[PDB]
């Protein structure tokens, strides 16, 4: 219902098709936060 850009369209498509399934992905605001932190001299990333 929010900034998951690649997931909003998929959920809408699944709802119209009658599936009612969710592909969560990752919010866009967290990416914005990571970019804003990296704009300072602070390294930050996600490991595996």
């Amino acid at each position: 219902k929010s900034d998951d850009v690649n997931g909003r369209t998929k959920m809408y498509k699944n709802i119209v098709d009658g599936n009612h399934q969710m592909e969560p992905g990752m919010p866009e605001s967290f990416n914005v936060l990571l970019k804003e932190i990296r704009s300072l001299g602070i390294n930050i990333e996600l490991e595996d």
Binding site: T9, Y12, K13, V16
Partner: peptide, 22 residues
Amino acid sequence: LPVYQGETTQTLQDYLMWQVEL
């Protein structure tokens, strides 16, 4: 406050892609 974070608009290509998705 200064105005920021404008809205996203729907151009022709985006609308056509939206219709292709469904």
